[model samples]
Target: PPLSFHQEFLCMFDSGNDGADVGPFGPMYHIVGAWRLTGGIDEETLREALGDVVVRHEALRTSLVREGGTHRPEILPAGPAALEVRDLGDVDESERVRRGEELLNEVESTGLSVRELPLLRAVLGRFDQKDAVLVLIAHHTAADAWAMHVIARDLLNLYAARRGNPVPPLPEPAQHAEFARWEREAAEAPRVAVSKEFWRKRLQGARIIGLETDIPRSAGLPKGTAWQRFAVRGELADAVVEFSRAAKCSPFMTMFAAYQVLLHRRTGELDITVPTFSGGRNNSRFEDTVGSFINFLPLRTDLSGCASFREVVLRTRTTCGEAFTHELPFSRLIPEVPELMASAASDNHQISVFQAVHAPASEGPEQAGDLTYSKIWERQLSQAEGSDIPDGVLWSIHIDPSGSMAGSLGYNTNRFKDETMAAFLADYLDVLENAVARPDAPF
Candidate 1:
């Protein structure tokens, strides 16, 4: 019952019925970023640096095809064949962001063809202080935010290794490709069967949780999109750490619990489920390789008697303790537990959450060597156009090394309005900030 190479390959390219159900929620979307190298970078050396990245992550050299019953993975070796690097020394900072945004808009408008596992391309050039801007656009289908960190860390590590420096080492990760195989196999095992039974009984009659928004979801994706970003700052963030310590859990669990409480109040639901994303790269074996190494497992919670925010947070802390240990592939969980996976509504998931663990712009390399490099990213929706599997009400929260946190509420513009989603996101942030403010308050 292991997931075949084709099944794993198929998931990325299939784009699901409405595309929403393809992978997780956001992954069906695309991801992008841009990094500016502060120092000057040599054209040849930069080329070599990118080349090493493609070499280390095999999926960077991948292609797809429709064969027989499913799409087959035509995984290619790590090489520079699929990556594009352009020189843009003439561009300025404003132009770099402008052009980067333009590239994303183009890719977003272009959509996906029948057979592609999310393509990537980059623009590189030197600027003042010998700096260079490097921008990368990747389909969320092929990579998530954490995967980007792996890509960044390893890309630089490989570049450094090629530069004749000692490279840091870590254990390997389970090959995502192989994990595909294991997923299918694992889904049918006795353990999975037992787990399925546990979920069915534990979550019987539970509702897929959702947040109300004003954005209107259209037949397909909406046109003329815009982004409004805000962050949680000052004593509020610190309050969370202090609370987390008192709660005897990590910041993530605390944040997770607060969200559960918020959702409960907003939706008036006692039994709830929220799809949560995890790195899925638990080990180091597949750490060097990258290809959609993420899972969207639902975190089901019971909030019947929780009196205070702190009580809810502690319960959520307990929920996470179970989730990470019992995480499984979303696709497989569907058929195995029809009661939980089947929806009275049309979409596959009631709600989805993606937590980010990577910081977008961070300084690189301890020492400035003879070579210079920069990193850039462009975010786009993955999944093919005109597919249906779920309604989009996805939530994402991020924690960086600086002890700061940010949240993103990605919605289907066709379904919700800007002002409405803004308010919804603000509410979640408000509750979180409020809980942080009242860390010593009783639940």
Candidate 2:
């Protein structure tokens, strides 16, 4: 099939090649999922269901080919995907989990070859007769986090059906090529022009306030990436929710403003710009489709002489409101504001971005018939080497189902120390607490 690449895909393509190991853009662009399946799961049945999923979503079976200026997404005929099965039946539950984590990390750190069709990989490990772990890995160019959820849901439902249980028939998902076709047309029209104009004006005269690093980036810096994960629970978490209610903004916005406050206090720079992404499923048609539909954009906020964090929240709320309204893919919008691209050329500042996804607390091990499965969040111990961050520090915030928020600060090992990021996260939590408690207090 002859289909054009969307702006987001094109931008991702411009980064580099299709190999998982090669980069500037390789492992960083891979999306992975690890799930623990307990109870009775027939390996053959599970593999067949995974094959159905690959056939169901074109994204899973699509490969890329570079054309003249951009690339083309080629949808391949559906077939059985590569599923690596490991036998860890001899280990105890704890040892099995440890081994599972090791395998999951290896699967994720191992990149998918984009040139190959069927960009999905599954690893099923049998801990014993009644338990197993399934790991799914794919290139981000093919799927995002939401898409992974869709895949998992479909995989489970299909598994049930294949096991001779009654399952509800799912509606046919919209093809990503269809969205790509629409996006190409949409980008050439006035809507894109308006969005570009909005970004240009909004980001005009904006200075990229990168995080002040403890030391300058050097050639000897390790290429490995590391992160510190922390959360705000109990009273502070409740306070965040309460204040967001009072402020008439989402909890994400409230917390985002706090992060901006942290950046300002740390760098002493008032004009702060951080890159972030939207779910990009705003279009109703692509809501359930598995494809890389995310659009990356920069959020700029000014805090020069701000009186209080309350004022900052209001200002940020407005900034977010406008940016979301005109959320064009950064690839298409970057041309409007050329300076953003230019800023990277200068070594004076470090580039960093943040992503926030608020979802219901992860689903516990779900059961159907004789099978139960749970999402494996983090592993206890793994000897696998760390992967490098493609850019600078990328901070992510996840608002759990309980309304409390958790965050991960991913930093380049060469540019920062664990102690530095640890303190930064602590300060951010403290700042978050203070902002909610004393929204009207001075900076």
Candidate 3:
């Protein structure tokens, strides 16, 4: 059966081909994650399990068909999921890692067509008798960062079951199409009018917050992109959580308030509107489903005449509370304000949005008999080649098991220099630190 894509997915589909890179949301949109496995893997069993996952998640088996000037998702029947295996056992240990990174880069540069069925790919690079890198990539349309973790967790269980192990069955998966149907119906409901009016006023004079770029903005897609990784250590991360608790706000608000301060310091803009995303899985039904369930949220904050960091945090807390409450689909939200959409499109910055995603550290590895699998934190390689930055700049932070918040600033190489982003990151951390120490201090 044919299904209309979610409003958010439809927005991605519309701009899927606009970027210089090729993937899902843009030319460089792809979801990539790797696991460092240190146990014997049955290639056939693993492959079968991978195929089963493709069969299980409709999003993985979905393809886009353009008709009447719009694209709709069509789920394909279960089939073999493509997985490439590279045996680097003969290579030196160090060389194996280098080659594995190169393999990831090659796969990343290799674009997947959404029109093609099964927009997912995997690569297994073996280095020794008990060590390998398991890489998975999916079109951004198929999965988001949250979905990636779900896929990995499920893949492990499925592989174990296929390997003759007794694994508990996973709950029945919810399809993305159902959420789309619910959204369509919600749009026509009376409550939607409240959200529409709220956004109409909240974003009345909203404009993109422009950071100073080293080079002039280019009209075409970026020639290239780069990522600079950084981390907020455990102490500071803990401080953030502590401050949030004291303020009765979320860590997201505390960090976002600091981020807005950083932007203000850089651009001197009082009214800041940077794009971010929410999982959009507040609904329990889609909580465990593997699909693209991110909602593009424009975080509009007014830091004008702000007296202290505490004031900013309080303001941000209220803004987030209200915005999320009225968080409609971006596609639906944009149509309410034509000028806002026009302003967004007219910018030559390519992507004016800045995303901040907080993911907790993985639960390490799982073991079944002699088989062991550990999620690989390939920070360097992921920074170097895994996926291209989608917009002008994006800040992704993760709270690890150790309580440290580590993340990176991904930027279009064509627009800004590494030095510029590095400084921006340093300033962001500095602001966070200062905000924690002196919440009532004047800016």
Candidate 4:
């Protein structure tokens, strides 16, 4: 099949020879949120809500099959499919947490076909308990960090509506299929082609660029053992706007520059390559589509003569302008600019950063809905050491609508230790704070 929107996406990650362990894009979008439903949720009523959700999102009912020796997401008709919503009737309050944990682990281990509705496992743990947890696990291919929020709000509201009540109104979402079509067309257009050429020339002699860590590859795969959380908070996240005012740069450039500084300090390398992803699924057609909309690019940050963090940020801003001009799907870039592939396949060189701001459910309701809800999920990501990405590290971050930020760093456990990543997070925070506190100072 000449790649359809979804088909083209699958191909990007599924190049057999590439055998890169990172292709299970949909299987990776897993999350777990917990909350106590103040009122009892009737089983039939809950089923109706979930049924409607299946109708709204096609991937939920999808399945994958090897047709012509390649796996593709077989999208089902937009409607309800059999969703196993087991009512684990009344149980002890204290055991709810234990039960929830078990349910999450089971769903996390079991993946759905990319073609089917990314399976949503609803495990009602200790329903009899006051604080029972409702865990929901869906593949990342089906949703983004923002989409997760949308599902949580909509699911709870729909459940309440089934029981008889009006919830907030939602403007129709731009479907993923629609965006996929748009991307296919736009990516192939002359404008994007010209943009591709720009990147080809700009990054002519770059390498994957490596970052050193203390973890040994022989240690085997370790669970995601390190976590760090930071907040850009009031005035600071907004500092980009203020700084942009003076520097004549976009906020993204300022932030990206800061990231480069963080990278340089830890890696001791002046010219570093990092990947940043945009919610490129901008078109409404792809708003609800379940496929990867992420594009990774190698940003070569040159800090050769930079005297301070501010100068570094200014330089980053300039690069950001050029990047936006030349932005294209990474899959396309690899072939278009063969040199990018030539930049030695060092694991340390493959770094990715994901950024997006999610605002709260501002459009739907004038007041918070009565029904309470939570995400029933957990995620444990691992790396295959001997595979293509033996030394790369990915720092994926998301800023939710509430202005709160949270994310995970994926790396080869063999090449980087738990503490090394933890410490890097500390350093990132320290500098980010220092930058915000002393914006004018040179460092």
Candidate 5:
């Protein structure tokens, strides 16, 4: 079958196989999840459970065939999964913290071929008795961040059931192929025609907005990507929630609006188009399906008549609601406004994607039977080789279940200096803080 829009767009953005530590699947085009596990884990039982997940989820068995420059996604026959268990020897509790990040970096840096059977890979790094880190690396072509949680949930439940515990039976899983076909058939409907028209007129004369860089794209640029991390907590995080409730919007809408205000202050541009991702699991049937169902949507908001932050938030709420209502897949929608990205295409200029990530509603130390599944988030790390954003910057803001917010700003090294991104983050925090503190004030 043909590749889904999410998978195809990733192929379009892929860095390909020629680069360092990159697979034919491309560089950093994999969703990696690491969890610190507690309680007794049966090694052999866990391996069998891993195999069961791969066999059960058709998406995990996907293989992509490169037809010239294009890709044809195929569902390979189900197969047993492999578990690579590494002995890290005995380590102290404090040292485990350091190694966990290193474990994630190592897994991400390793290559998983797109054509490889079973688009999933697992690594269990045992630091000591009752202490280990479980890493699940799913090809982004097959799984997005939402699917990561489903994978984790299924893997752990299967392991528990295999260990002689009574586990709730999982629903017969849905496959990704069904989604691609549904999208293809649905594209011809009148509903989609309305959406096509909306995108046609909405972005007719617009170019996706690009971040103003310290160095011009025409200048000599550095290779690869760089990152910086920042966090907001206490009053500010709570303020975001309160403000959203008051505005009848979500935390994402409020926070994203603040980012627009940040860009407005920096570039003095009233009209903004930012790239964001939608969960794309609109059809409840595919809720348990593991595959790339994430959709990229362009959010264009005209802030011309808006003065107060309150007004901006309300407008942002409407903008998001409308986009999601008339959302079309990028592969289909891009054709309507063929050169929507022309402004950023010049030189090394890159569009920025802003996302508020809340992976698996329940950010945990969540329990899967007897095991504690706590997610590991990397707060700060620098690498010349990092997750490939392709030709853009990614601002990932995570809201923890603890009523706190943390963010990572990743950008191309050639376009942004370390100091530039650091300063940009600082200003964004200041702007968000000011808006939360006084939403009625004029900018």
Candidate 6:
């Protein structure tokens, strides 16, 4: 079956001629998540459950075949999903989270091929008899951040069932093959042609923007990625949600205004085009399908003479509503605007992507069955290539259902100094605070 639009975009960055049956993904485009699990795990049951998950989601056991310069999935027999258990001995409880963060980097430093069977792999870091860190990595071709939640839930549910616990079986998951069929069928629909025309005129002659790097990429650089995680002040966080309502827009609309404001200040550019990951689950049918389903949407915002934050927010709201109203496949949309991404291909500069992740989440640690899993969100390795970033800089702020927000900056250590990235983050929050407090403030 054909790959999803998200999958196709990835293939654009893939390479079929690499040493292995590798596409442009190479070994570093893997999506990863770690959980500090409570309650002792039965290694045998875990291994069995992991295999069940691969079998349940067709994407985990799928192969790629390129024909006519496009690739499609060739479902393969499920292979053993390897779970390596490493005994790290015991450590102080205070330093456990920090150590677990290091453990993630250690796991990420080791490479996994996109062509590898059972596209997912797990590493169990044992701290003691009852404490452990579970790290799972799936090829980007197969999953996104949201898929991680589904994967963890299914894996734990299966583990409990395998351990003789009476657990209800999960519904038969929707397969990726079905997604491909539906997307292809809807390709030439009337709505699509309308969207095509919309992007053609909307994005005409707009230049993309990115964070200016401290060092040029022409110099000697190294592989790996780094991160800076910070908390949003409770009042400031509340202000965003509060003002978003008053402005008659989603939290993302206001958030992007602050971000676009910073880009204008830093680069002195106008009418900037930025890309973001759209919730590809609009087709509820693919909610359970595990393959990549995110759509890349380019937002062209013009800050020509927008002197106040409120004005920028108003401008952004209209743009987002219009773009969201029209959903166009990114691969197809790219052809209409040949010069769209031309500005982002430089060696020293990387296109910056700003997205607000409003997670549909529950409060605190969640127990699937017998095990309690805590998302290790706050304890990320400060500077490591474990969660290697994609080709560009990623600015993500996670908004839980509770309305509080936190964010992370993912960048190439080779392109940016830690202090440089750190300062950038501080400036972003300061600008956001002002935007919320005084929307009429100067841009």
TM-scores for every candidate against the unseen true structure: 0.77, 0.86, 0.87, 0.73, 0.92, 0.90
lDDT of each: 0.56, 0.72, 0.72, 0.55, 0.80, 0.78
Which sections of candidate 6 miss by over 4 Å? 15-24, 65-72, 88-92, 214-223, 358-360
Q: Is candidate 5 or candidate 6 better by lDDT?
A: 5
Candidate 1: residue 278 Cα off by (Å): 1.7
* Each candidate: RMSD: 5.3, 3.5, 3.4, 5.6, 2.6, 2.8
| Candidate 2 to truth, TM | 0.86
Which residue pairs come into collision in candidate 3? 21-27, 22-27
TM-score of 6: 0.90
- Please state the error at residue 361 of candidate 2 in Å: 7.8
User: What's the CA error at residue 346 for candidate 4, in Å?
Assistant: 3.2
| Tens digit per residue, CA lDDT, model 3, 1-443 | 34433434345435453424332344356767777787888888888888988888888878766555456677878666567898866577777767776766677666666676657888898887688888888887788777877787788788888777777778887887777677677779999899999998999977656565666654453455576766677789899888888999877788888888887777677887877777777887776677777777887888888899999999898888888899987878877765654433334433445455533345667665457776644454435434655445677766555455657677777667778777888898999999998999876
For model 2, residues 204-289, the per-residue Cα lDDT tens digits are 97755566565565444445566565666768988988898898988888888998998877877788887777777788787778
| Residue pair clashes in candidate 5 | 222-414
For model 4, the superposed segments whose C-alpha errors exceed 4 Å read 1-40, 67-69, 77-118, 124-134, 168-175, 213-255, 288-291, 341-344, 347-350, 354-369, 372-391, 400-403
- The candidate 4 region of ten consecutive residues with least summed lDDT is 382-391
For model 5, how does the per-residue alpha-carbon lDDT over 1-443 read when each residue is reduced to its tens digit? Answer: 68888776676565454544332266366668888899878889899999999888888888887667677777778777579998766778767877776777778766677676757889998987788999999877888788988899999999998887877889987788888899889888989888898889998887788776666777855445666766676789999988887878888888899999998988789999898988888888888889888788899999998979999989999999999999888888988988788756567467899997636777457776788877776445444556556667888887776667877788877778888888888898899989989999976
lDDT of 6 by residue, 220-246 (tens): 466556767776878888999999888
lDDT of 1 by residue, 218-308 (tens): 2444422334345666477778877787778788878777777677777788776776766666755555556666666677888787767
TM-score winner between candidates 3 and 4: 3
Which candidate should be chosen as best, given TM-score against the real structure? 5
